[PDB]
């Protein structure tokens, strides 16, 4: 199954087809992704388990509208399924408890008066939507893998990884996971953090003369792609 669309396709999602404002859907995905990130954090979940649920969440709304399916209910269902897939399972009851603590009275209204049944029913739909393609990999894996092949100042390289890690967490609030493979995202956040800290990442590679250091990690990726991914991440902080 192919899990990657282009921006033209992202401008024609089932949500926007029902007349939803493209800027509002972007907001709904931010709220939803950050929701899964928050609930899972308070339950002390692996950083991959969080990202797994978010990718389920993003993929779900490529086939379903936000006007038909409440985001916080879907996110809770994604986190629940992700816990079993990544084998760090949490009781569905305890997810709702965490959800009630984070959400206000209006937001929690999406779960109705019986949140458990509302989430359990949705799981049958979620599995069908993701076509039982449960296993997913995230930029975190490749971020550490690529950074462990850089010869240079241990202090500067360490800082590069920290900032890059933050940018990966931010990219999960975007549709980037639906756009590019994790290997590319892992590179892009290194590219961004490198440009911000004025780090010459090439000077840490086997070929310091070559300027496109990333071509030893990912194949056929123009600088336009990396630059584009940066701008999608940077506009999160923008207002």
């Amino acid at each position: 199954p192919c899990w990657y669309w282009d921006k033209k396709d992202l401008a024609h999602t089932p949500s926007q087809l029902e007349g939803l404002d493209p800027a509002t859907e972007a907001r709904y995905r931010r709220e939803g992704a950050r929701f899964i990130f928050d609930v899972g954090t308070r339950l002390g979940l692996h950083y991959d388990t969080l990202a797994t649920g978010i990718i389920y969440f993003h993929r779900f709304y490529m086939f379903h509208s936000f006007k038909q399916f409440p985001r916080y209910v879907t996110g809770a269902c994604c986190l629940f399924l992700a816990g079993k897939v990544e084998e760090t399972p949490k009781k569905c009851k305890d997810i709702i408890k965490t959800a009630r603590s984070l959400l206000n009275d209006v937001q929690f209204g999406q779960f109705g008066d019986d949140p458990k049944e509302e989430v359990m029913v949705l799981e049958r739909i979620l599995l069908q939507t993701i076509k039982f393609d449960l296993q997913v990999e995230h930029p975190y894996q490749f971020l550490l893998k690529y950074a462990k092949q850089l010869k240079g100042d241990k202090n500067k390289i360490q800082k590069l990884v920290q900032m890059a890690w933050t940018f990966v967490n931010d990219s999960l609030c975007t549709t980037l996971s639906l756009q590019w493979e994790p290997e590319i995202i892992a590179v892009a956040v290194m590219y961004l953090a490198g440009r911000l800290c004025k780090f010459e990442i090439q000077e840490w590679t086997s070929k310091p003369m070559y300027r496109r250091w990333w071509e030893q990690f990912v194949q056929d990726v123009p600088v336009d792609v990396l630059e584009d991914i940066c701008h999608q991440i940077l506009d999160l902080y923008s207002q």
Partner: protein
């Protein structure tokens, strides 16, 4: 491909009561040919989707081999109370049932073609860093066209050669369980699957299982009586096991003596598969190169005489 189709499968009859749901026999309307349907219900459980089924699905999508049961598709019925169905390629018989009846006896060339397919499947699973962890005569599926597939990947898990992985002790079930597990090993190797196949290899020549006990202590004694007692000379790292001094049965390895009828080339494999020390035991890749299976050309083999019941 997308996996969310309605049951366009005409059900023939119930096969049995497998894990988390009955297993039906059917044939799809479009393609044709037979298909096994493992039913998974949601209305029974607060597990939502059963996690045990999740691991099986995650593994089968990544195992694509001629001698491994491959999951074809996942279908549905259609706030509903529905159920999912795992689609598997149908196999007519299993090795246990064929041996239960006194009807089927296998030639030397049948066993060769069978052990070949079985170990060729394990090498694929072991190279993909997967432990079967439940290999037995019943979990080996055989059809009427000589083809053999390994099934039941529920208790399967991922393996790391970095030895940074302590797993579950209660594995393989008692009869086919390796000596390391019976002594309390938790950080083991794919060699536990090889021991099981060794217990199956000997089973084929003797029609009945070679180690049958009700207690775990008793099981160790049966292995000891034939393979020899766990001595440090034969097995140096046996002292590092929790239940070593508490489960002492000494016995001389009379394996070749009690399997004299078995061909010399065949007994060489059975001897190396059933060695106590896991580190000093044949692997999957090694067993496919022994005298009893190196020259076995599968395409030159004739199908068995399996009767339809």
């Amino acid at each position: 491909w997308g996996k969310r189709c309605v049951d366009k499968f005409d059900i023939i009859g119930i096969i049995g009561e497998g894990t988390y749901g009955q297993v039906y026999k059917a044939k799809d309307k479009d393609t044709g040919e037979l298909v096994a349907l493992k039913k998974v219900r949601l209305d029974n459980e607060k597990e939502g989707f059963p996690i045990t089924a999740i691991r099986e699905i995650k593994i089968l999508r990544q195992l694509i081999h001629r001698s491994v049961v491959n999951m074809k598709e996942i279908v549905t019925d259609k706030k509903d109370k529905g159920a999912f169905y795992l689609v598997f390629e149908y196999m007519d018989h299993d090795l246990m049932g064929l041996l239960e009846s006194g009807l089927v006896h296998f030639s030397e060339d049948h066993i060769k073609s069978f052990m070949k397919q079985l170990m060729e499947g394990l090498e694929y699973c072991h190279k993909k860093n997967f432990l079967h962890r439940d290999i037995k005569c019943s979990n080996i599926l055989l059809n009427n066209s000589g083809q053999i597939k390994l099934a039941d990947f529920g208790l399967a898990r991922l393996y790391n050669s970095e030895e940074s992985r302590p797993y579950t002790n209660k594995v393989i079930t008692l009869w086919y369980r390796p000596p390391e597990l019976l002594l309390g090993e938790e950080r083991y190797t794919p060699a536990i699957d090889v021991w099981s196949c060794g217990c199956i290899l000997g089973e084929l020549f003797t029609k009945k299982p070679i180690f049958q006990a009700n207690l775990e202590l008793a099981q160790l004694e049966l292995i000891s009586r034939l393979c020899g007692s766990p001595c440090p000379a034969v097995w140096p790292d046996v002292i590092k096991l929790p239940y070593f001094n508490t489960m002492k049965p000494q016995y001389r390895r009379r394996l070749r003596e009690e399997f004299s009828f078995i061909p010399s080339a065949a007994l060489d494999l059975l001897d190396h598969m059933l060695t106590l020390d896991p580190s000093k035991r044949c692997t999957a890749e090694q067993t496919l190169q022994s005298d009893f299976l190196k020259d076995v050309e599968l395409s030159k083999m004739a199908p068995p005489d399996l009767p339809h019941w």
